[PDB]
């Protein structure tokens, strides 16, 4: 069991994207946020964010951004691994969410995406 | 609300892009500007720039550039958050604008774009 | 022969890609993994990973990611060089594998891929 | 007017591209050059270059290259701002030119390219 | 002439690409190699490599790689400038080559590629 990989939404698509610069607390940050759909439906949790200088995992901001962007471009089916209730900037969470983006993997069927699932 | 996110234009397209290097004050800078339209119309503020070593927020130059270029390439509907009357180099502002680029988010209808609204 | 180039699969395709951030041991890491098919079949070794701050070769993370993603986009025949039984984090291996990604070369025919062979 | 923005070619296309590594003096450098055309014509200035550790603006090498490469790909109309008589290495300028690349902007018509112009 | 720019092959296509990590001479390195064709033929020197921590010019590894990947993608006509027999790790040379990548420029036709040429 990988820590932080037990909260995911599978077979979703990235259909919105935000990227910006922002001062939060006392730090100048960059952030991006993905908006999620599942076909014509909107998943329960639909907005996941990553911030360069805040979070449980500060590494990989540029790589995650490029990855998100590619998937937004193709619109393909992906699994999004995320972490709930991370951001405490109430201004930020009101506008986007408290969710922190952890990983994105691809799917090869309505039923299977790459990466760990809750056993079983 | 999010500081610096109260000034924006929704459902615009990035129909022109400028990138260049330039000496301003006594500092060597990089800059890019987006030119905007809303359909056949030109909005109030239509030129918005970001500069690597100047501005209210200096971070994110490369990621903001890569992002603007993506949207220039697709011609898709976006919202642009910016900050007014930032640049003090009067040669620059005359040629482009005094507007600093803060964020770019995507839009799915004339109603909804991602990010905070007022 | 070249150290670490004795183990490979030729003429497979990358049909899935994983990228994420993860704490392993005491380190904050990035990883990505390619998932492999050979046509419609799954090959013996089907999952190969690279991690920025762990491995036989920590260099080239961004360039290896960029390369994988490229071949994922095209779906072309590649030959993949890898090192088995590298990762010792048993939560990682169970979720992906213990194979470390060493190199990716291209293929012009079902008979030839670039790079050393045994 | 912006200092280095008086010299430009409008509504051209980048139809050739060079990139390489080169020792000039005792300084190891990278350079890239754009080759220009105007539809079927070739403008007065047809070769323009940027070098990572030489020139009037050493910054923005990676971004300028990515920008030029993109425009090379789409082959679209751009405006090119440059600086003449920069490069002192006579081997380099005989091989390419003495022109330094300052900026690249896009054009939405034959009448308009983004960026300043003269009177 | 430009030092290191007198050895080249014009109007070739990059038809193969290798990228990997590797330990040589007790240093941890990245390398990539382009493989070349000329139409239905294979030029005299068909494999040219660049290595991040070794070579006559160690700069520009990411930019050269990105450049070579682009031309692998398009399969278009290019001129490759290289330097011969630089690599001394015989494992590597037997597997790939001993040639170091110096520059890549684009061609408009079989008469003209960008960059310095011999008379
Ligand atoms: C492209 C450009 O405009 N560059 C100029 C920058 C930018 O306008 C600025 O960084 C964006 O915020 O500004 C430069 O001039 C500033 C500098 O001389 C500082 C010196 O401390 O003063 C600034 O004015 C301040 C002033 O210091 C405060 O007392 C108070 O009045 O606020 C004003 C707000 O501007 C100058 O604008 C710079 O070098 O930083 C000149 C650049 O050409
Ligand atoms: C993602 C992951 O698996 N990370 C683990 C890493 C990687 O397996 C490793 O870096 C791959 O090269 O390994 C970690 O555990 C190693 C660490 O405790 C070191 C301390 O010296 O010991 C390693 O085992 C060695 C051992 O040191 C040798 O004496 C001999 O027994 O061989 C083994 C072979 O590995 C541990 O693998 C790490 O801390 O780097 C744990 C990571 O979670
Ligand atoms: C991929 C690879 O082959 N790496 C080897 C490198 C490169 O071939 C080299 O950098 C090419 O420029 O070479 C290594 O061995 C060199 C090293 O031991 C140095 C010591 O400083 O000597 C080099 O040969 C010199 C020689 O010392 C001089 O007398 C004169 O002949 O110049 C030559 C230049 O080739 C060795 O080639 C290295 O570690 O740098 C071994 C690498 O595996
Ligand atoms: C944290 C969590 O709830 N994870 C669930 C996930 C979400 O609950 C769900 O997506 C909320 O929108 O749902 C998962 O299972 C899904 C199925 O319930 C659905 O019928 O089909 C989906 C694929 O199209 C998906 O398999 C999921 O997204 O994987 C299960 C997961 O643990
Ligand atoms: C190092 C060297 O000899 N370089 C030559 C080059 C090579 O010999 C050749 O590429 C080996 O395959 O050949 C050059 O001239 C070429 C002609 O030999 C060829 O018939 O047509 C080529 C264009 O398709 C080209 O004109 C070259 O590649 O430029 C000359 C170069 O110095
Ligand atoms: C974008 C954001 O929400 N930043 C906030 C962070 C993050 O919530 C945590 O770092 C999450 O781990 O927490 C703070 O206490 C901090 O570190 O300054 C306040 C800050 O404003
Ligand atoms: Ca051509
Ligand atoms: Cl754990
Ligand atoms: Cl979890
Ligand atoms: Cl949400
Ligand atoms: Cl993309
Ligand atoms: Cl304006
Ligand atoms: Cl496997
Ligand atoms: Cl010229
Ligand atoms: Cl074209
Ligand atoms: Cl245009
Ligand atoms: Cl060869």
3-state secondary structure A48-84: EEEECCCCCCCCCHHHHHHHHHHHHHHCCCEEEEEEC
Q: What is the DSSP letter of D72?
A: H
Structure-block tokens of residue B118:
């007022």
Chain C CB contacts of A14 under 8 Å are none
Quick one: which of D82, D13, D21 has its CA closest to D51? D21
Q: Could you tell me the two tokens for C5?
A: 């180039």
CA atoms within 13 A on the CB side of A113: 24
Give the alpha-carbon dihedral of D42, D45, D47, D52, to 10 degrees.
Answer: -150
Q: Collapsing DSSP states into helix, strand and coil, what is residue B84?
A: coil
Measured from the Cβ of residue B104, the count of other Cβ atoms closer than 10 Å reads 26
Q: State the number of CA atoms in the 13 A half-sphere of D24 facing the CB.
A: 18
If we measure between CA atoms, which residue out of D39, D42, D60 comes closest to residue D50?
D60
Question: Which residues are within 8 A (CB) of C107 and not within 5 positions of it... i.e. 6 or more apart?
Answer: C10, C11, C76, C77, C78, C79, C113, C114
d(CA B88, CA B9): 23
Instruction: Look up residue D13 and give its two tokens.
Output: 């296309």
φ, ψ (nearest 5 deg) of residue D28: -70, 125
3-state secondary structure of A86: coil
DSSP letter at B88 equals -
Q: Kindly provide the resolution of this structure in angstroms, with one decimal.
A: 2.2
Give the C-alpha separation, D50 to D34, whole Å: 9
State the helix-helix crossing angle for D61-74 and B61-74, rounded to 10 degrees: 10
Buried b / exposed e across A50-85, counting CB within 10 Å, b at 16+? bbbebbebebbbebbbbbbbbbbeeeebbbbbbbee
For residue D110, give the 3-state DSSP assignment. coil
Q: How many domains does chain D have?
A: 1
- In chain D, residues with a C-beta closer than 8 Å to the C-beta of B23 are 3-4, 56-57
Burial-class residue B38 by CB neighbours within 10 Å (0-12, 13-18, 19+): middle
DSSP for chain E reads --TT-S-EEEEEEEEEEEEEEEEETTEEEEEEEEEEEBTTB--SS-EEEEETTSSS--S-HHHHHHHHHHHHHH---EEEEEESS----HHHHHHS-SPEEEEEEEBSSSS-BSS----
CB–CB of E22/C3 below 8 Å? yes
- Cβ atoms D15, D8 nearer than 8 A: no
- The residue whose CA is least distant from atom 14 of ligand 3 is E25
Tell me whether residues D64 and B15 touch, CB distance under 8 A: no
What gap in Å lies between CA B81 and CA A96, rounded to an integer?
A: 15
How many angstroms separate the CA atoms of E119 and E114, rounded?
A: 14
How long a stretch of residues is chain E? 119
CA dihedral C5, C10, C13, C19 (to 10 degrees): -10
The string over E50-63, giving b where at least 16 C-beta atoms fall within 10 Å of a residue's C-beta and e elsewhere, is bbbebbebebbbeb
Query: Cα torsion for E113, E116, E118, E119, to the nearest 10°?
Result: 80
Q: Are E35 and E1 in contact (CB under 8 A)?
A: no
Pocket mutation for ligand 4, best pick of A10, A48, A99, A117 (most atoms within 8 Å of C-beta) = A10
Quick one: tokens of A68?
Answer: 């998100």
Residues of E in contact with D65 (CB under 8 A): 63
Contact state of E105 with D19 under an 8 Å Cβ cutoff = yes
Q: Which residues are within 8 A (CB) of B29 and not within 5 positions of it... i.e. 6 or more apart?
A: B21, B22, B23, B51, B52, B53, B54, D59
Fill in the DSSP letter of residue C88. -
Rounded distance between C-alpha atoms, residue D42 and residue D78, angstroms = 14
Positions at the binding site of D: 74, 107
Say how far residue B101 (Cα) sits from the centre of its chain.
Answer: 4
Calculate Rg over the CA atoms of chain A: 14
Distance between CA D45 and CA D100 in Å, rounded?
Answer: 11
Token pair 């291209």 in the structure block, residue: C106
Cis peptide, bond prior to residue A120, ω within 30 of zero: yes
Q: State whether the beta carbon of B33 lies less than 6 angstroms from ligand 1.
A: no
| Residue among E113, A17, E38 at smallest CA distance from B78 | A17
| Sequence-distant (≥ 6) Cβ neighbours of residue A30 within 8 angstroms | A19, A20, A21, A22, A51, A52, A61, B59, B60, B63
For D66: left if phi > 0, alpha if psi spans -120 to 50, otherwise beta; the answer is alpha
Contact predicate C7/C80, CB 8 Å: no
∠ at Cα A77 (A74, A78), nearest 5°? 105
| Residues D116, D2, B63: CA angle, nearest 5 degrees | 80
Q: Which atom of ligand 6 is nearest to the CA of A31?
A: 1
Neighbours of chain D (3+ CB pairs under 8 A): B, E
CA-closest candidate to residue D2, choices B97, B94, B30: B94
Whose CA is closest to A4, among B97, D24, D78, C31?
C31
List of residues 6+ apart from D7 with CB closer than 8 A: D81, D82, D83, D84, D102
Tell me the C-alpha distance between E83 and E101, whole Å: 7
**Kind and range of the H or E run holding B70:** helix B61-74
Is there a contact between B20 and D106 if contact means CB atoms under 8 Å apart?
Answer: no
Q: Across chain B, how many H-helices and E-strands are there? A: 2, 5
From the CB of residue B32, how many other CB atoms can be counted at a distance below 10 Å? 25
> What is the residue range of D64's domain?
1-119
Burial class (CB in 10 A: 0-12, 13-18, 19+), C110: exposed
Residues 6 or more apart whose CB falls under 8 angstroms from that of E77 comprise E11, E12, E13, E106, E107, E110, E113
Do the Cβ atoms of D18 and E59 come within 8 Å?
A: no
Q: Which helix (H) or strand (E) holds B73?
A: helix B61-74
Contact between C31 and C19 (Cβ < 8 Å): yes
Taking each helix axis from N to C end, the angle separating C61-74 and E61-74, rounded to the nearest 10 degrees, works out to 10
- Is residue B74 part of an annotated ligand binding site? yes
The CATH number that applies at residue B81 is: 2.40.50.110
CA–CA gap between residue A115 and residue A105 (Å, rounded): 7
Compute the 3-state secondary structure of chain A and give helix, strand, coil in percent, each to the nearest 5.
15, 40, 40
Please enumerate in sequence order all residues whose Cβ is within 8 A of that of A106, keeping only pairs 6 or more positions apart, or say none. Answer: A76, A77, A78, A79, A113, A114, C16, C17, C18, C35, C72
Alpha carbon of E93 to ligand 14 centroid (Å): 39
Rg (alpha carbons) of chain D, rounded to whole number: 14
């Amino acid at each position: 069991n990988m820590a932080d990989y037990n909260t995911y939404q599978s077979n979703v698509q990235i259909n919105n994207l935000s990227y910006g610069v922002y001062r939060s607390g006392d730090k100048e940050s960059q952030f991006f946020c993905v908006g999620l759909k599942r076909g014509s439906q909107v998943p329960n949790v639909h907005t996941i964010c990553k911030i360069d200088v805040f979070g449980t995992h500060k590494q990989g901001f540029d790589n995650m951004l490029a990855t998100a962007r590619y998937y937004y471009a193709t619109g393909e089916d992906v699994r999004i691994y995320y972490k709930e209730n991370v951001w405490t900037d109430r201004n930020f969470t009101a506008a986007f969410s408290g969710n922190e983006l952890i990983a994105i993997t691809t799917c090869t069927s309505s039923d299977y995406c790459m990466g760990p699932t809750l056993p079983n």
